Symmetry: D3
Subunit: 188 residues, 6 copies
Amino acid sequence: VLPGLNYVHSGFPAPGLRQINRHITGHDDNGKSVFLSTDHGDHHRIMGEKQAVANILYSTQETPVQLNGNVDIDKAAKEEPPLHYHNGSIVRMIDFAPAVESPLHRAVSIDYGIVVEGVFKLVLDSGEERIMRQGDVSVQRATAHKWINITDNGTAPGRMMWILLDCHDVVVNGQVMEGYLGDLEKEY
Amino acid sequence: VLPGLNYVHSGFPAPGLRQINRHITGHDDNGKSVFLSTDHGDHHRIMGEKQAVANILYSTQETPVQLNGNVDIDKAAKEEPPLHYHNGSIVRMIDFAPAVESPLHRAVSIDYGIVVEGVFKLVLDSGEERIMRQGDVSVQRATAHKWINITDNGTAPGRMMWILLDCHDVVVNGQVMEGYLGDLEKE
Amino acid sequence: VLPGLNYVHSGFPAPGLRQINRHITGHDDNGKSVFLSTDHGDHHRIMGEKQAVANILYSTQETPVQLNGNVDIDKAAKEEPPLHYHNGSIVRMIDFAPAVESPLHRAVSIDYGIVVEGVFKLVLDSGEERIMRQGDVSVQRATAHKWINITDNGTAPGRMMWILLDCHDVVVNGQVMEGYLGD
Amino acid sequence: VLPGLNYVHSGFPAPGLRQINRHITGHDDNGKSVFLSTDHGDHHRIMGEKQAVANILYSTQETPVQLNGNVDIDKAAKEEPPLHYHNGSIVRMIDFAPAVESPLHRAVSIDYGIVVEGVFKLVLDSGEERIMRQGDVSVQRATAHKWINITDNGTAPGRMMWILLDCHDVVVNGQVMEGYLGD
Amino acid sequence: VLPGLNYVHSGFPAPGLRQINRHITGHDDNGKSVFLSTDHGDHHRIMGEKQAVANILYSTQETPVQLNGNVDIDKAAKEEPPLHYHNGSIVRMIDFAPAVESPLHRAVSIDYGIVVEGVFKLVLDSGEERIMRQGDVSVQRATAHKWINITDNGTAPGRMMWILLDCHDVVVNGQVMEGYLGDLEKEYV
Amino acid sequence: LPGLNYVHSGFPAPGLRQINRHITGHDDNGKSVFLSTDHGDHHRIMGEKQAVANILYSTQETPVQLNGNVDIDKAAKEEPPLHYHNGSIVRMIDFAPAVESPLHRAVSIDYGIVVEGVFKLVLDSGEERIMRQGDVSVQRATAHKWINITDNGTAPGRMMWILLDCHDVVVNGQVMEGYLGD
Ligand SMILES: CCCCC/C=C/CCC1=C(CO)C(=O)C[C@H](O)C1
Ligand SMILES: CCCCC/C=C/CCC1=C(CO)C(=O)C[C@H](O)C1
Ligand SMILES: CCCCC/C=C/CCC1=C(CO)C(=O)C[C@H](O)C1
Ligand SMILES: CCCCC/C=C/CCC1=C(CO)C(=O)C[C@H](O)C1
Ligand SMILES: CCCCC/C=C/CCC1=C(CO)C(=O)C[C@H](O)C1
Ligand SMILES: CCCCC/C=C/CCC1=C(CO)C(=O)C[C@H](O)C1
């Protein structure tokens, strides 16, 4: 039984989760701060067999970010970003179908995760786990892990948001803790 | 009357909002990914006359982040960070007392904001405004703004979270959009 | 300023409201009861200046309903139904942007209404109103009314669902109380 | 042990579920649309061993509905409706005790079902199943099915509302698919 | 416009609020602890113009409480208690209609109050007030006050629960602060 | 061990809300005023940081003596015991996920209410009731156990009890002794 098979029938948002507002601010040609856009995000991507859907709220590709001439807006909207940006950031929102889990994987990045809706289980390759509820926050420091949606005993959708930042490779007594995607390669 | 006067009586979390779990992962001596800590955050800071309380969930001070030797954990924990870090990041969570307002201010940083609980109004120096509900997200590109907690017609606490990154100066018509701390009294 | 102007930026569902599952059941080759579809509904229509959006979950066009050959499914999906079907039914679900209100209007129709999310004010042409919270049910008997979304003091979206049934013209004191769209 | 045995101890609403407001509209002497009554429904019926309770919010016995002289109101109030009315409608709300389920059964009618509170499992005789959460909607086309309250892993009450309409009987392979009451 | 007029049309619970379970425990003749009842409370009383309904979850009439022969159970069930029992307790739960307000009154009693549902404003005769949300608790020490249901800008019902205990008369400057009920007097006659 | 080290910052437990406790009083002009707004009193970690209690008030005589604010002083000065003879205790407890109390009996009558979550109340006869938010229990000196079953043992829960003094429960000439249990 593939969990969440064909659950996400209408892209973002997944059934049972809320449509959002993303607001981007900026300056007009008089120097006044205004809103530039209100929308549903960007670069929506179905994951698995309609088991999840990702939503890229923003991205940057250099540090510090260049805002003049609105080049960061164009850069974020021009291309769908990869897993993570070197010297940059990605804000990726993913809706989980009931009981959907990620593969055990490692990205070489530092990730700030917050539970937007539902209950998620964060399982590391050691077997240690934490149950994260709405509002709880994780700082994933380039560790091998998998995310499991356990909301309402596996009957409810859930939503996570991650902010992915660039980090150097993790080295433990000579050896690189190399990145691997498992089955998440298909989505990127 | 000043809103939220003496409302936050026991730091974080503000009365009416939930205590949190912050989980930090890392590697043990065998290269296994483990949980290093589970706590309530860090560098709690009362704001105003007990009108709000901030919670620094993490911070970084270089790009890319250096993680080996747990150097990033030490830097985040040994100093209270400033408003924002150059070439770095700050995850700042803030509990608002009912009807509490930020000053009209500008930080020279790009901020990813999300409403964790409640309803907030984002007003910009042009007078343009958006009402942001739980789960809504704003991308603040070094703009002058204020945050207004309006939850339950101004009778309920609210919680925001921001991730502040470093950004270059914004130059409009050859003039720098200089950052400024506000003053609510003069408004 | 117009309430909820440009609020509904991505059709159904409105921002702050949940996507739905509509399940339609049927019969297979050997008479076993199965599921024929799971979807977001049908015939989504923006209303006003992106101030609301309707979703037609189902409709029938005769009484009693004819299910054989799945022709009822065909009738429901092949054309967008009108406001109200004669000798039939319409399941119309509508997401309201914050503080968006309906025009005072009358349809020759008996309406089963349920608040799916939010707080609504039902106002009749006499001035009488009832505030309806989530799960409350109204039976509109061809009366003239307007629906006002008041969720969270006019700052939150709301969702109503109606089932509209055909009724005979209502006569009060020898006068037929006529339908009107208002706007 | 029977699920939800004696759980419903004071009729409608079941413990843990909210009392409702049912509003009925009508016309007064001068043709003004007014509210006629606000109540808790009608024809409350305990089901099983106090394992559930049904609330009939409205019914009609003819299409189109006759509303003049409030005869539809008097008919809806005068007698407890049956499972479903020929050429008519029934608004039937039911509170489920924790873990309670219906018998596998078939009514020859087309039902619109919406989850009012809780989480329900809709199992068909083929074994196919869908989980329906709050606001999810089902169109039951005279199929054989079970309703199972699974709210909070079988420890919480749940509420469903159905609008049952008359339908012609479903014929498969030349065989009348006969409605049965199960248990 | 009188707030909450005719809102409570079916007693307890008020429309928009949940029906409750009240479990009472006891002993059988073998010393085993058993459940004696599960119900909707006791002594339901509509208040005002069907603007509120009260639900007496329990009461006691002596201290310490006598439980043998289940006599405490029968004393609580056989009679609707007054506002307050000398040397005893009352658990009073009250459903408010939208925007419904109690009169300014004083009970010579120490009351433990908890907001079960909604948002309430506790106003004392000094003009001071506190907004109490769900889970918030007050300890009312024979003070003059009123309760205001302000849930959802005055359009939603709310529920409070109180545990009233007996207290001595509060004297301030050799003058007893006398209890008074105002329009609440019609509700306990 | 359920909830081991879950309560990492005292009251409130992670996932549960901070409270306001308001105590009213009298002016020197006889005016009813607010004397304090706080987070309760006498917080106590229980188990291996598996639960935390919060004492909202307590009284030590019946009827209660409010003059001179002596009731406030007595409630604040010392942490109360399990229950007070001739008096009351308002005890709020946050439970970590899946945490259960021991099977035990106190010689008191307890008014319980679920503030948040889902709790199973188990009596020594094996009889149980699942109590949800808003449900109330009248514990008449019975041997019992409380189990936090919120969201299948994965969420915290909160109960509040008002404990009152009762006489010994004698069944067939034998006193039903209290015990703390294991
Ligand atoms: C097909 C089944 C799984 C689909 C959903 C996967 C989500 C979690 C994986 C993940 C992503 C997305 O690739 C990140 O962006 C980094 C973050 O830490 C974890
Ligand atoms: C006493 C009144 C002020 C307290 C209310 C909250 C203010 C939020 C201001 C803010 C901060 C904190 O300095 C940021 O980190 C950036 C973010 O956009 C707005
Ligand atoms: C842009 C502002 C107008 C749109 C807001 C929603 C209006 C609902 C009107 C309605 C319909 C749809 O036409 C029905 O299905 C009958 C039911 O009584 C009320
Ligand atoms: C003893 C426990 C079972 C009884 C409780 C609920 C059963 C609902 C069955 C049902 C009815 C009831 O008449 C309908 O009206 C059609 C609708 O599809 C399902
Ligand atoms: C019809 C207007 C009033 C309806 C709402 C009811 C409020 C009662 C307030 C109250 C009472 C009554 O005396 C108590 O039971 C003690 C406690 O302190 C507050
Ligand atoms: C092993 C970690 C702690 C387990 C959870 C604690 C339960 C509270 C026990 C209790 C008390 C205080 O001992 C009361 O106030 C009476 C009420 O019935 C149950």
